[PDB]
Specification:
This is part of a larger assembly, with chains A (about 240 residues), B (about 160 residues), C (about 90 residues) and D (about 50 residues).
Chain A (H helix, E strand, L loop, with lengths): L5 H10 L6 H8 L8 H24 L8 H33 L9 H17 L9 H20 L7 H21 L5 H8 L5 H9 L19 H13 L1
Chain B lengths: L6 E4 L3 E11 L6 E7 L6 E5 L3 H4 L7 H12 L10 H12 L4 H16 L5 H21 L3 H13 L1
Helix pairs in contact in B: 2-4, 4-5, 5-6
Chain D lengths: L1 H4 L4 H9 L5 H12 L7 H6 L1
The chains are: A mainly alpha (about 240), B alpha+beta (about 160), C alpha+beta (about 90), D mainly alpha (about 50).
Chain A binds one DNA strand of 39 nucleotides through α2, α4 and α6.
DNA sequence: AAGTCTAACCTATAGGATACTTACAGGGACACGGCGAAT
C-alpha cells in the first residue's frame, strides 16, 4: 500500500529515531542519496572542470588583472560554486559504491568504518584524476584508486609495530603463497621453498615472518599477562666507588 | 562423440581421458554423460553427449596445427606498450579460451620478456602453467616422451 | 656541569620559548618546540625558510591531462547556457 | 479462524477484542515496524522476513 | 679513528582504466516517562 499515507507516516516516524550503531547510521546517511547516470556523471565532470578553470582564472587575474564586469564576475562565481556542488553530489552518489567495495576487506586489522573513510579518500583522489574524454564508466576507473587508497591505509595503520610499505607487500605476498602452497601440496612448505620461489638467500623469509608477527596484548586471561613481566649491582657500584676512596 | 579410452581436449584443463558414457536417467532422460578423467587431481567430469560440443569437448589438433603453431611462435615483432595490465588480461583471456596458437604466442612473448629482464612473481607461474599444458598436448599428439617434448619445445622456442 | 646555555625562539602564537643546549654548539635556526610547531630565533641569522611549493593541487592534475582551449570552450558553453537561463 | 478454533477460553476472546488491530496486512505492518525500526515497511518484505 | 670519501638500498610518494551501488544473573536505585483529577 503506497499512498496509504499511514504506511508512509510510519516510515517517516521511523526515520526519526535515536539509533546508536554508526555503521547502520552511515548506511542511512548514504541512504538519503541515490545513484548516478553515466552520461549525467560526464556532464558533472564537465561542470567540475569548468568551475575549476574559472576559479584558477580568477586567481591568475587577481594580481595586476582587470576590473571584471559585475555580470561576468557573478556568472563565473556561480560556475565555480556549481562545480563544487557538482563534485559534492558526485561523491554523494559514489559513497554507495565505495562502501560496497570496502565491505570486502572487513574482519581484519581495522574498523570497517575506518575502511569506509579511507575508501572515501581514495574516491576523492579518483575524481581528482578522472578522465572522461574516452567516455567510459566512472566506477571501473575509480575502483583502482579506491583500492589503492585503502590498501595504502591498511599498510600504514595495520600493526602497532610500524613496518614499511614494501614490507607489507612482501608479507602479504608471503601469506598468499603460503596459503596456495598448502592448498596444493597439503604439507607445510619449508622456508627454503619460499627462498627459491622468490630467489633469495635463506634469511629473508625468516625476517619477513618475524615482522609479520602480531603483538600480543599484555591484557590476557587464563588474568592479564602484564602482571607477570619482569640491588646487588646498585649496592655494589656505591661500594666500589667508596673502595676507590 | 568418443568411444571408451579416447583422448580428449577439454579446456582450460587440456588433456583428459574418457572411460565410458554412463547414461544417467536423471530428469527422465538417460543423460549420456561421457565420464572423463583429468591428470591434475584425477577429477571426474560427466559431460552430456547432447551438448558435448558446446562445453568444449574436442580432439587434439593434428600435425598441421603443430606446424602452424611452430610458425606462430617463430614470428617476431609482436609489440607491446610499457604497462602490464593489457598483456595480463589479454593472456588471461586467450589462455582461458583453450586455443593452441594464441597460448603459444603469449607464452613466447612472456618467455622472451622474462629472459630480457624478469617481470614479476605470478606471471612466472602463468608462464610455467602454459608451458606445461603445451608440453602435455604436444606429447599427447606425438606421444614423444614428454620430457623430450619439453626439451624440444625449449629448443625450437629459443631458435 | 658542562658550560651550558639556553637557545631562544618564539612560536607563532606569541609565547616566547626556550630550550637548553651546551655552550659549544650551533644554536639552530629552527626548532620544534614543546607546544608542537616549528619556530625560529629572535636573535639574528634569519635563515629565510623558503617553503617549497605544495605537493599537489587539483589544477595541475587537470593540466597534465588537459589543455586550455577545450576548457575555454566548456567555460563558454556554461556561460551561454546560464545567460539563456537568466535572460534568454 | 481464531474464534472458531477457540470458543471457550475467556482470556483469548478478551485479547481478540482488546487487540485493537485489524487485518493480516496491518498485523504484518505493525510487526515489521516493531522488529525493523527505521525500515519502510512493505507486506512482501514482512512475510518474507 | 672520526673524518671524510665512496658507493649503494630503501622508502614515501605517485600511477594504472570492461564490470561491479545499502554491513555482520539479581537487586537496588534513579531517571525517563503512562494514567488520572483540577483549573
Amino acid at each position: 500500500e503506497d499512498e496509504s499515507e499511514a504506511l508512509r507516516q510510519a516510515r517517516k516516524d521511523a526515520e526519526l529515531t535515536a539509533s546508536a550503531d554508526s555503521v547502520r547510521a552511515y548506511l542511512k546517511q548514504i541512504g538519503k542519496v541515490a545513484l548516478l547516470n553515466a552520461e549525467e556523471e560526464v556532464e558533472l565532470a564537465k561542470r567540475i572542470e569548468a568551475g575549476l578553470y574559472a576559479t584558477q582564472l580568477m586567481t591568475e587575474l587577481s594580481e595586476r588583472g582587470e576590473k571584471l564586469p559585475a555580470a561576468q564576475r557573478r556568472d563565473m562565481m556561480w560556475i565555480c560554486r556549481d562545480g563544487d556542488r557538482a563534485k559534492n553530489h558526485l561523491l554523494e552518489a559514489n559513497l554507495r559504491l565505495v562502501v560496497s567495495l570496502a565491505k570486502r576487506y572487513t574482519g581484519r586489522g581495522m574498523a570497517f568504518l575506518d575502511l569506509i573513510q579511507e575508501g572515501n579518500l581514495g574516491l576523492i583522489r579518483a575524481v581528482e584524476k578522472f578522465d572522461y574524454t574516452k567516455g567510459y564508466k566512472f566506477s571501473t576507473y575509480a575502483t583502482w584508486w579506491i583500492r589503492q587508497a585503502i590498501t595504502r591505509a591498511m599498510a600504514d595503520q595495520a600493526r602497532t609495530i610500524r613496518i614499511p610499505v614494501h614490507m607489507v607487500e612482501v608479507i602479504n605476498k608471503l601469506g598468499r603463497i603460503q596459503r596456495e602452497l598448502l592448498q596444493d601440496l597439503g604439507r607445510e612448505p619449508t622456508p627454503e621453498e619460499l627462498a627459491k620461489e622468490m630467489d633469495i638467500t635463506p634469511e629473508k623469509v625468516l625476517e619477513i615472518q618475524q615482522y609479520a608477527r602480531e603483538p600480543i596484548s599484555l591484557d590476557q586471561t587464563i588474568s592479564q599477562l602484564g602482571d607477570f613481566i619482569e640491588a646487588v649491582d646498585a649496592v655494589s657500584f656505591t661500594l666500589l666507588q667508596d673502595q676507590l676512596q | 562423440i568418443f568411444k571408451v579410452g579416447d583422448t580428449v581436449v577439454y579446456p582450460h584443463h587440456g588433456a583428459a581421458l574418457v572411460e565410458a558414457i554412463e547414461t544417467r536417467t536423471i530428469k527422465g532422460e538417460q543423460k549420456e554423460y561421457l565420464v572423463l578423467k583429468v591428470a591434475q587431481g584425477d577429477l571426474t567430469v560427466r559431460v552430456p553427449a547432447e551438448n558435448a560440443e558446446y562445453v568444449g569437448v574436442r580432439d587434439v589438433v593434428g600435425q598441421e596445427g603443430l606446424d602452424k603453431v611452430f610458425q606462430v611462435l617463430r614470428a617476431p615483432h609482436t609489440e607491446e606498450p610499457t604497462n602490464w595490465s593489457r598483456r595480463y588480461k589479454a593472456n588471461l583471456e586467450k589462455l582461458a579460451s583453450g586455443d593452441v596458437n594464441k597460448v603459444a604466442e603469449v607464452v613466447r612473448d612472456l618467455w622472451r620478456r622474462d629472459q630480457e629482464r624478469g617481470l614479476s612473481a605470478g606471471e612466472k607461474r602463468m608462464l610455467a602453467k602454459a608451458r606445461q599444458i603445451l608440453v602435455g598436448e604436444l606429447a599427447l599428439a606425438e606421444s614423444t616422451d614428454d620430457a623430450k617434448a619439453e626439451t624440444i619445445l625449449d629448443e625450437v622456442l629459443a631458435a | 656541569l658542562a658550560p651550558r646555555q639556553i637557545a631562544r625562539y618564539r612560536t607563532d602564537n606569541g609565547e616566547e620559548f626556550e630550550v637548553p643546549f651546551a655552550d659549544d654548539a650551533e644554536i639552530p635556526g629552527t626548532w620544534l618546540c614543546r607546544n608542537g610547531m616549528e619556530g625560529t630565533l629572535i636573535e639574528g641569522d634569519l635563515p629565510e625558510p623558503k617553503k617549497v611549493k605544495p605537493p599537489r593541487t587539483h589544477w595541475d592534475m587537470l593540466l597534465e591531462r588537459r589543455s586550455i582551449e577545450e576548457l575555454e570552450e566548456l567555460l563558454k558553453e556554461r556561460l551561454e547556457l546560464i545567460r539563456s537561463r537568466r535572460r534568454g | 479462524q481464531i474464534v472458531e478454533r477457540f470458543g471457550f477460553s475467556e482470556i483469548m476472546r478478551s485479547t481478540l477484542e482488546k487487540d485493537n488491530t485489524v487485518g493480516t496486512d496491518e498485523a504484518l505492518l505493525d510487526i515489521y515496524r516493531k522488529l525493523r525500526p527505521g525500515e519502510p515497511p512493505t507486506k512482501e518484505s514482512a512475510q518474507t522476513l
